[PDB]
């Protein structure tokens, strides 16, 4: 049977400069629109009607301060389809109401699905095991938990991260002041995976480059390698002795070493995603009850835990009126928490 | 401080007093460690994806490599053939030496910049300040996300070390 | 009537050390939150 | 300090039950030929 389906399959899987595949029908439009939406919005679109903020090059923002901001809190969790009941097919209103945010987030979500299908698709054609696709589940878990689950637990899309450099920094600081997110053990595991991953990256790369076999005569050692050679290009035996004597333990199995390099950052990102799922419901690691009981009764008891809550309290009171304009917070000077003099 | 919550305290006060999030050396540092973690999982998944079949399904594939063996344990040409098609051919490494050099250099250089961020904010050359940078035709301040960051920084500033300042400016 | 699907199970010494380190470090991390 | 007193047995079983699992598996591996 060589019908139209099989002929299409042939064409989609041609060896060209940019492989396409069946996955490409999903991947390429959604990735292109998410990126084009971010560039369009950060270049031309305001956040005046949703946040009270300028947010485009057109308005005078720079690369650090442009964003595609979330919709107004009054939109709830509306899909904000261009043809939906809020914008009603009006492209200009849609932009002013935050429609580009759901546009980027939803096309991005489906773009990510498409990229992971691409990893599966190419792996199956070339004949390799699909561990690259499996590792990519971690970025997907992060994207889905932070940009979709988290706001879906909260009051509206407004509290999702906005797509911009400084907007993401505000997101970090909001999470410290309101969620005490540094205290959360699921974030701590994520930090360990990310920093442990960076560590493994540096130490593996440096170890290989400094246990190389002399396989050529030049002082630039890059040339003395051939992709089809059968021999290891560096000495696992010498690498093992060096690290055993420097650090006490060392890898001896090169397959385990490289699985571990997959395992560590991937597991870390997955743990951080679980904690953010908790924060969707405000299910925080905010306090230690035993510390609070002692500190309430004993005004001489002070720890770095109680010091940090005072900082969180400052963050909340000083940023909430501007950061949450739909709430209409009016905090007179006299109610603002402040230490002496400052 | 030499402690877990003490570290967080140091970080929060650092942000209030230097706006480290807006400093390009911290941003290069984040690229270093995000990128290092990405390339860690990348390299691990590509080598793992191209291990040469040396074992049955009831045993760990790790027994297919023997400490000290002369021959490489995975097929770099198949890894390159996969990854070159994922992106495009010339975005992929086929030289294990320069690949492993890139793995060394990207996190190390990024963390150098992070260390130099802290070391130069030590002399009070601080992150970018765009507070009230956007002004309308009359002169009203138009807030950006930078000004929202400033509100958060102020709340950290006024509360930290709440009994330690007698004069209006925190100059160190 | 011996079942032909049985297989021996292994855990080598390095896996024991790695596993015990994971469990002890996770306990050291979560214990504070258990006591609260 | 007024800690949650169940924290003790929760931590103890958290360490003991998985650690014991690993020790059983390891020891019966050494005892094989």
């Amino acid at each position: 049977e060589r019908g139209w389906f099989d002929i299409l399959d042939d064409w989609l899987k041609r060896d060209r400069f940019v492989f396409v595949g069946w996955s490409g029908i999903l991947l390429f439009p959604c990735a292109y629109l998410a990126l084009g939406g971010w560039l369009t919005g950060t270049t031309f679109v305001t956040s005046w009607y949703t946040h009270g903020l300028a947010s485009s090059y057109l308005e005078g923002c720079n690369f650090l301060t442009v964003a595609v901001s979330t919709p107004a809190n009054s939109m709830g969790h509306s899909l904000l389809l261009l043809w939906g009941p809020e914008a009603q097919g009006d492209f200009t209103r849609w932009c002013q109401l935050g429609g580009l945010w759901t546009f980027i987030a939803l096309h991005g979500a489906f773009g990510l699905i498409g990229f992971m299908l691409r990893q599966f698709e190419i792996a199956r054609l070339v004949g390799v095991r699909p561990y690259n696709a499996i590792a990519f589940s971690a970025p997907i878990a992060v994207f889905v938990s932070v940009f979709l689950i988290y706001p879906l637990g909260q009051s509206s899309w407004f509290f999702a991260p906005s797509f911009g450099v400084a907007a993401i920094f505000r997101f970090l600081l909001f999470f410290q002041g309101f969620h005490n997110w540094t205290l959360n053990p699921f974030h701590m595991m994520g930090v360990a995976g990310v920093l442990g991953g960076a560590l493994l990256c540096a130490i593996h790369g440096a170890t290989v480059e400094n246990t190389l076999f002399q396989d050529g005569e030049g002082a630039s050692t890059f040339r003395a390698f051939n992709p089809t050679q059968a021999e290891e290009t560096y000495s696992m035996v010498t690498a093992n002795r060096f690290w055993s004597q420097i650090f006490g333990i060392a890898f001896s199995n090169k397959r385990w070493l490289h699985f571990f390099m997959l395992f560590v950052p991937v597991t870390g990102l997955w743990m951080s995603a679980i904690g953010v799922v908790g924060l969707a419901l405000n299910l925080r690691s905010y306090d230690f009850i035993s510390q609070e009981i002692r500190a309430a009764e004993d005004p001489e008891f002070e720890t770095f835990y109680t010091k940090n809550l005072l900082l969180n309290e400052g963050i909340r009171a000083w940023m909430a009126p501007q950061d949450q304009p739909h709430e209409n917070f009016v905090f007179p000077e006299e109610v603002l928490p402040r230490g002496n003099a400052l | 401080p030499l402690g877990i919550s003490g570290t967080f305290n140091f970080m929060i006060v650092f942000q209030a007093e230097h706006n480290i999030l807006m400093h390009p050396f911290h941003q290069l540092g984040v690229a270093g460690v995000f990128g290092g973690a990405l390339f860690c999982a990348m390299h691990g998944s590509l080598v793992t994806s191209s291990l040469i079949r040396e074992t049955t399904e009831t045993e760990s594939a790790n027994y297919g490599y023997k400490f000290g063996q002369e021959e490489e344990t995975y097929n770099i040409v198949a890894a390159h053939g996969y990854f070159g098609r994922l992106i495009f051919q010339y975005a992929s490494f086929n030289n294990s030496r320069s690949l492993h050099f890139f793995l060394a250099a990207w996190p190390v250089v990024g963390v150098w910049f992070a260390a130099l961020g802290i070391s130069t904010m030590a002399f009070n050359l601080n992150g970018f300040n765009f507070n009230h940078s956007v002004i309308d035709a009359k002169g009203n301040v138009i807030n950006t996300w930078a000004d929202i960051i400033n509100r958060a920084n102020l709340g950290m500033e006024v509360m930290h070390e709440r009994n330690a300042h007698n004069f209006p400016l925190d100059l160190a | 009537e011996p079942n032909p699907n049985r297989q021996p199970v292994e855990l080598n010494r390095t896996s024991l050390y790695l596993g015990l380190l994971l469990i002890l470090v996770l306990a050291l991390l979560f214990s504070s939150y258990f006591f609260n | 300090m007024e800690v949650n007193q169940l924290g003790l047995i929760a931590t103890a079983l958290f360490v003991l039950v998985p650690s014991v699992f690993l020790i059983i598996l390891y020891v019966q591996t050494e005892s094989q030929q």
Partner: peptide
């Protein structure tokens, strides 16, 4: 109680370090 727990867990880890370094499976070349 909680102090004893924290220090006990910590002490087990330091003991584990000792065995992992000095009573490891020797790497053997082939």
């Amino acid at each position: 109680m909680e102090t004893i727990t924290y220090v006990f867990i910590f002490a087990c880890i330091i003991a584990l370090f000792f065995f992992a370094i000095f009573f490891r499976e020797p790497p053997r070349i082939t």
